[PDB]
């Protein structure tokens, strides 16, 4: 029954005695920027002593403070070092220096789901169900450890060499029993309760699964507009439109996931996630073979070699400068 039992015992031990300071910058060769954002970037690096390639996330401590993301940042690394699941990107090392925080993760060369979805336009329902299944298993794992993920989007899902998903960016992930209130996430993916400040729980993640699945199958999100305020008005308004190519089952799933009514939103009711797992739209899914990676991927990325980055966009390179004075040392003490 509860595979989660074992799971949780291993997580809790890592959670209370988290790994710290397990490498240093000079052990890595910087190769290229794979992505960028708010408090820092993600770089392809090469581990000098093994020749392994990694993805190194760099956060400027001063910028993290300025954006009021200190706690979120400590959350991110504490949780990511403690979890373990086939569709969750692995944290190999972490450390910090005078200026930055570093999280050295598994390199996933297939690029972002985002890139292939926009390029291809939309996915086939079976294709989208393959990915979705992976997220349904990941969310039941995460929620079983009392974690909210809070940042689901194709931009955050990487495609591996086998065509399976790896979830990245735990910048908003949080271990919380009960409910929480932070306004965070991505406008297209927010649940009604977040926008309305009602206080919320892991149900927000199940809505987000509703947005993802829709976006994947249709090629655009269920709620979009040129500015975020308009997007909130749409989400809050209780109304969704579906492409005529959506199959009946899929509309029914989505109607239950993009459920403004917490008491009726799927994954949030008495039967939990089995309400999702048992749905007819997932009728042809072997949940077990999906976990064991025994299903055949719809799509397998092309990479002309190791450390090859054609599946990622090009970003302007910037130098990693390290100050001679320690910055915000007390704020990031436990990192």
């Amino acid at each position: 029954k509860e595979f989660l039992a074992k799971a949780k015992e291993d997580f809790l031990k890592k959670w209370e005695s988290p790994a710290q300071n397990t490498a240093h910058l000079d052990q890595f060769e910087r190769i290229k920027t794979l992505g960028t954002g708010s408090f820092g970037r993600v770089m392809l690096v090469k581990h000098k002593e093994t020749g392994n390639h990694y993805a190194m996330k760099i956060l400027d401590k001063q910028k993290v403070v300025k954006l009021k993301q200190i706690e979120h940042t400590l959350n991110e690394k504490r949780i990511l070092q403690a979890v373990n699941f086939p569709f969750l990107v692995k944290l190999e090392f972490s450390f910090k220096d005078n200026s930055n925080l570093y999280m050295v993760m598994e390199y996933v060369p297939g690029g972002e789901m985002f890139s292939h979805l926009r390029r291809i336009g939309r996915f086939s329902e079976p294709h989208a169900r393959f990915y979705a299944a992976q997220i349904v298993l990941t969310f039941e794992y995460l929620h079983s450890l009392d974690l909210i993920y809070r940042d689901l989007k194709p931009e955050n899902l990487l495609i591996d060499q086998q065509g399976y998903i790896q979830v990245t960016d735990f910048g908003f992930a949080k271990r919380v029993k009960g409910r929480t209130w932070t306004l965070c996430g991505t406008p297209e993916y927010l649940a009604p309760e977040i926008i309305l400040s009602k206080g919320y729980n892991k149900a927000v993640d199940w809505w987000a699964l509703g947005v993802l699945i829709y976006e994947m199958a249709a090629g655009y999100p269920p709620f979009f507009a040129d500015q975020p305020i308009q997007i909130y008005e749409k989400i809050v308004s209780g109304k969704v439109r579906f492409p005529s190519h959506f199959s009946s089952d899929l509309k029914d799933l989505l109607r239950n996931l993009l459920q403004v009514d917490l008491t009726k939103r799927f994954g949030n009711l008495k039967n939990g996630v089995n309400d999702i797992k048992n749905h007819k739209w997932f009728a042809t899914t072997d949940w077990i073979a999906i976990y064991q990676r025994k299903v055949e991927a719809p799509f397998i990325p092309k990479f002309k070699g190791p450390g090859d980055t054609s599946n990622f966009d090009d970003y302007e390179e910037e130098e990693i400068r390290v100050s001679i004075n320690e910055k915000c040392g007390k704020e990031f003490s436990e990192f």
Partner: peptide
């Protein structure tokens, strides 16, 4: 079409979290 509206919208690139 909704797809055409999307594509012409200012949100088809990577979306920043809030």
């Amino acid at each position: 079409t909704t797809y055409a509206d999307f594509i012409a919208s200012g949100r088809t690139g990577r979306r920043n979290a809030i």
